[model samples]
Target chain A: GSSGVRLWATRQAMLGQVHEVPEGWLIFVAEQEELYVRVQNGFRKVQLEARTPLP
Target chain B: GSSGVRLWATRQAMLGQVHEVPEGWLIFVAEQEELYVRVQNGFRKVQLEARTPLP
Candidate 1:
């Protein structure tokens, strides 16, 4: 994490003592709270639509 | 971390030297690759509707 601003997302998740977490769901780490999508062993970070909620 | 199986997700992300992450987007952590949505202050974990992709 670097010295920068931050953003708001409709959703955010973390690995914890949850009931369960299904597979095939995109997982991400919290870093400056940026959006990044998986692209195989790698990832492709992208900006979600303004104030858009994933459906 | 716990001991469990795994699943497949078309998308996944991690906090790193990413270009940028848009605001208001749901950020999820990798937990057996489960799906979870932000519920403000707290979170409500849910299973994705099949091998679905966020739109």
Candidate 2:
């Protein structure tokens, strides 16, 4: 049985655990909340609050 | 206003917001703590605990 839900490119969920993504993938996470993405050779994380603007 | 003191090379603060990094960039963050790096396409995130051993 499938453990998680999967959506197509247009209706894909913005927040959730994702794996096996191709290299050079860009994604956006809304402010205030937190999301996680893991990759080999370290990880890049970005956190922004509702009012916290990008520097 | 410059709130934090800037350190020279080797001493420059490694923890902070970084942007415009070239593709296929590799960075490291200490264990236990959380760090964030954002780039186009998607972001790579890694968190290591102080006692969390690395493979």
Candidate 3:
């Protein structure tokens, strides 16, 4: 938790805010209409890769 | 919101849960010890870009 942004562990709906996801944290985006997972490379970087789409 | 992922407006301490960040949302990660913002390019794709380091 840094930069005033909080971290979440439960994989579910998120409001409008910055979040710090775990290594394997998952998320869903309505804009993209798909599910995504938060991934960390342990190099001061992270990315949200696609996991699935709306069912 | 989708996939049970909830969204939050207050950018502060977050619990353990998957979240849906808006186009200009932001976040803070302790693993990388940095700050990032959620960005969308209108292509069923999204990316978290670095903003700054923890203070």
Candidate 4:
């Protein structure tokens, strides 16, 4: 909450919404859009950002 | 306002995402990529490469 940056979870969950998140799924839930971010295994820690489509 | 951290709980979650994440899985997150770095449970503390497909 500090650092002057704003971020929060939407707490949005649906009932009977069965989904499978891949192993080590690093998702960023914020006020704006849900972002699914990660890196390829052999890369030098570069981020590959992608939008997470809401189910 | 976008550079730094506050040790906030990384909000990454999904529903019925039934898949056993291996115990002792160490995950590192940053501005770049989310790195799942860990020493294999054996000898030679070396990092391995793996891919996670979104389900």
Best by DockQ: 4
Candidates, ranked, lDDT: 3, 1, 2, 4
Best by lDDT: 3
Candidate 2's displacement at residue B2, Å, is: 33
Residue A51 in candidate 4, Cα distance off native in Å: 22
The runs of at least 3 residues in candidate 3 whose Cα sits more than 4 Å from the true structure, single-residue gaps closed, are A1-19, A42-55, B1-55
The candidates, ranked best first by DockQ, are 4, 3, 1, 2
TM-score for each model: 0.23, 0.26, 0.23, 0.19
Best by TM-score: 2
DockQ of each candidate's interface versus the true one?
0.05, 0.04, 0.06, 0.09
**Against the unseen true structure, what C-alpha lDDT does each candidate score?**
0.34, 0.32, 0.38, 0.31
Docking class of 1: incorrect
* Lowest lDDT 10-residue stretch of candidate 3 chain A: A2-11
lDDT of 2 by residue, A1-55 (tens): 1122122222144333244433333333333233333335333443432221224
Q: In model 4, what are the clashing residue pairs, if there are any?
A: none
Label model 4 with its docking quality class.
incorrect
lDDT of 3 by residue, B1-55 (tens): 2222224444243222214444334445444443334434321223546566779
Look at candidate 4 and tell me the lDDT of residue B20.
30
lDDT of 3 by residue, A1-55 (tens): 4222233333243443225444554454444433344446421223445432311
